[PDB]
């Protein structure tokens, strides 16, 4: 199909990969740091989602350098993915409006 849809699909799949890789890598980075809570995989996956969506409740977060770098990648991938879907939606509406005119 068209580019904007392919990119949206690709961005979504990629986002899911980053959430999975990020959850695993966050636990690896945080264990060994006294006080870290982002240390078991199930809640790390939850953490990765609320990070990618930019909600950031504060129930979980990284305290180490690498856990934070992993977090930054998760944030940017999430913002970029949703931004790209918005961009695809705009392309869709714009194309249609041209049609409604000619």
């Amino acid at each position, epitope marked *: 199909s068209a580019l904007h849809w392919r990119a949206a699909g690709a961005a979504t799949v990629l986002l899911v990969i980053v959430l999975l890789a990020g959850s695993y890598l966050a*636990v*690896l980075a*945080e*264990r060994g740091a*006294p*006080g*870290a*809570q982002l*240390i078991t995989y*199930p809640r790390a996956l939850w953490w990765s989602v609320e990070t990618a969506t930019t909600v950031g409740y504060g129930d979980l977060y990284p305290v180490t350098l690498w856990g934070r770098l992993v977090a930054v990648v998760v944030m940017v991938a999430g913002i970029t993915s949703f931004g790209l879907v918005t961009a695809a939606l705009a392309t869709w509406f714009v194309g249609r409006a041209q049609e409604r005119r000619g």
Partner: antibody
Amino acid sequence: QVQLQQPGAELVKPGASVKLSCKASGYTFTSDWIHWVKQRPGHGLEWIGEIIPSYGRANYNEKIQKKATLTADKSSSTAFMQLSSLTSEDSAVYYCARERGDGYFAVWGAGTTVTVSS
Amino acid sequence: DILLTQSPAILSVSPGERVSFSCRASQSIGTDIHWYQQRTNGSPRLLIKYASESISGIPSRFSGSGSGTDFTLSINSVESEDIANYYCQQSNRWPFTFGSGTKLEI
């Protein structure tokens, strides 16, 4: 079948070192962590450290004099704990346990009785 | 690091009576507490995970409760095979820590 295999015992002369093993069978995931716990006679369970075989990173109890060094051999599904320069304080049963990255020790090894004596 | 307190260290109960072991965390750990049983010369055995979740193979008699800083492991109608040491363990913060243990006496 026995998920975690540990030798029954190890005799070590004071000052020397010994390498304990923990052979795992059963389901194995890249996300499994192998933990080591020390228990002196008549006392409780003391957490020593952990290692993730798929990556090889290890963490240790910082609160106690560091006597251990953890390694893992992926091909033989065996985890190792190197204890060096031991004293009578190091004599105890050392258990290895498997954690699926979800916080609890689902299964434990039989433990290796380590004795420091001349 | 989280200090897990188990008091009393020894509990004497009569047969068939309900018993409760206490485990207190130095700070709130949600429900990230797990219980293990260790009989004489035996290895530890998981009884309850995340405060109250059942483990297959463990008798219905065992149950757990609590959240925050205070947790309880209970046994409905104790029998001889329950004679052992009981430990709590937390996985809320790194590093994992163990309670000091409680001995069950009948």
